[PDB]
Amino acid sequence: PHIIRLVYKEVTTLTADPPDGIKVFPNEEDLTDLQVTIEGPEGTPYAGGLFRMKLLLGKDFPASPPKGYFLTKIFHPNVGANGEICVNVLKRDWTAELGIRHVLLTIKCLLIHPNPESALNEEAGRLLLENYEEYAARARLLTEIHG
Amino acid sequence: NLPPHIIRLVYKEVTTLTADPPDGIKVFPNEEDLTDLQVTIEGPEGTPYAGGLFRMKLLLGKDFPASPPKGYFLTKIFHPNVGANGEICVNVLKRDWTAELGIRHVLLTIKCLLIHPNPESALNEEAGRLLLENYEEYAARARLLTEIHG
Ligand SMILES: [Cl-]
């Protein structure tokens, strides 16, 4: 359909001029399964790590937001046990014109600034709230082990 | 004014940032003062601010980088997290601030908040309350000021 072409143009431009600290590996055969690597941002517990993720464009894209999954093991209030990332504001504010680039930047933003109030991972969310420094130390350790 | 040694470390960062800014963000360092940074954020597509140009100043602050920089919109705007004097309040940035987070990131989160308001931490209570209780009038107001001032 027309959406395939739009995604291609959007993905090639994104791959050629990607966000700082984000790299996109497009796969010609399947453009609805985007492979992405996010550098652990400096000044965060993830500094120095490489976090692999995939962005699934659903059947209804762009009418619906894409679904993101970290494949690198991480401890984060908004990431499920199998890596599904829940970006509340994307689900709340989604419009077709927001773009894939924005989706990746918002994942990076959530990685840095978790939302423990509406956590997928209640254990990680309570830890951030009940002992912030320990949450950072444990995130740093897992970055060293898996990132 | 900042300590000269901090100005030194900041100078390289801003030079790099200005040469390769984030998409939709233009960064203008002043030829002399490196405690003030002029920035323009393009009104993101898919939001009530589409089509506008939103000009701000990033003030690093006497305690930078120990404390976060503070952004202020020169362009008048209707947004839950922008106060009467243009103060931009990014509450998560204040919560998670560390000295190595970097100026690029600060600007990216300001843009993120522009797209994704947080009515819980609203400095503009009317905009946060209107956003929750009556979104059409919220967007209409934000589009109106985007047209007038953007
Ligand atoms: Cl999961």
CA dihedral B24, B120, B101, B2 (to 10 degrees): 90
| Token pair for B100 | 């190595």
| Token pair for A69 | 């999954």
Asked how this structure was determined, the answer is X-ray
A53, A57, A86, A119: the active-site residue:
A86
End-to-end CA distance of chain A: 38
Instruction: Enumerate the residues of chain A whose CB falls inside 8 A of the CB of residue B101.
Output: 41-44, 112
| Token pair for A82 | 């199998």
If 0-12 CB within 10 Å is exposed, 13-18 middle and 19+ buried, where does residue B96 land?
buried
Residue (of B102, B112, B110) closest to B14 by Cα position: B102
Distance CA A85, CA A78 (A): 6
Among chain B residues, the shortest Cα distance to A112 is held by B96
Q: Side chain identity at A67, as an amino acid letter?
A: K
Distance CA B36, CA B60 (A): 6
Residue-number span of the structural domain to which B138 is assigned: 1-150
Are A84 and A67 in contact by the 8 Å Cβ rule? The answer is yes
Are B40 and B26 in contact by the 8 Å Cβ rule? The answer is yes
Distance CA A133, CA B101 (A): 16
| A43, A101, A109 member nearest B112 (Cβ) | A109
* β partners of residue A25: A35
Distance CA A107, CA A118 (A): 15
Are B132 and B149 in contact by the 8 Å Cβ rule? The answer is no
The resolution, in Å, is 2.0
Cα of A86 from ligand 1 centre, angstroms: 9
Distance CA A138, CA B76 (A): 42
- Helix, strand, coil fractions of chain B, as percent rounded to 5: 40, 15, 40
If 0-12 CB within 10 Å is exposed, 13-18 middle and 19+ buried, where does residue B40 land?
middle
Count structural domains, chain A: 1
